[PDB]
Symmetry: C3
Subunit: 27 residues, 3 copies
């Protein structure tokens, strides 16, 4: 389906397996 | 809700606080 | 407009030029 909003916490998110996941976990 | 397309400028973006921000910020 | 789902292969994606691109290519 279409992409929904990511969390409001001020952190950056990327898209993985139909979810928003913190960018920092990949870096 | 469903979010809008990111900028079309040829750069890569991540989602942060209800906006699109440049990936390069974090790399 | 709205954005289609990223690939569902378990990899992380970022948004670039109306496409999902692998985060890994930018690291």
């Amino acid at each position: 389906g279409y992409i929904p909003e990511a969390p409001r916490d001020x952190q950056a998110y990327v898209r993985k397996x139909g979810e928003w996941v913190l960018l920092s976990t990949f870096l």
